């Protein structure tokens, strides 16, 4: 049962890698987007 637990954690490593990478990209993309809306508000005024 140790072994099965440990193998399930093997599989879950990639889940953790993908969540970190994807949430990072999402955060960065939203930062760029909020910058873009800030510039849009600046121009519209």
């Amino acid at each position: 049962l140790f072994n099965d637990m440990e193998e399930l954690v093997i599989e879950q490593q990639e889940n953790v890698d993908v969540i970190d990478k994807n949430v990072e990209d999402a955060q960065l993309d939203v930062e760029q987007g909020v910058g873009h809306t800030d510039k849009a508000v600046k121009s519209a005024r």
């Binding site: 049962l1 879950q12 994807n22 999402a26 993309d29 760029q32």
Partner: protein, 60 residues
Amino acid sequence: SRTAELQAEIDDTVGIMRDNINKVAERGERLTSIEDKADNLAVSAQGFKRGANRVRKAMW
């Protein structure tokens, strides 16, 4: 009496760690769902960036 105590301790760890197996199965299901939703989140963030950029160009 020592060997019996060792046997009891091992049985208890077996029980604790079967519960651990069930918990890590639940954790794996949760992590799969979170992976799917974070792929969704990244796609949505890119779309929001692009739409905000297009609006920025529009008002300029």
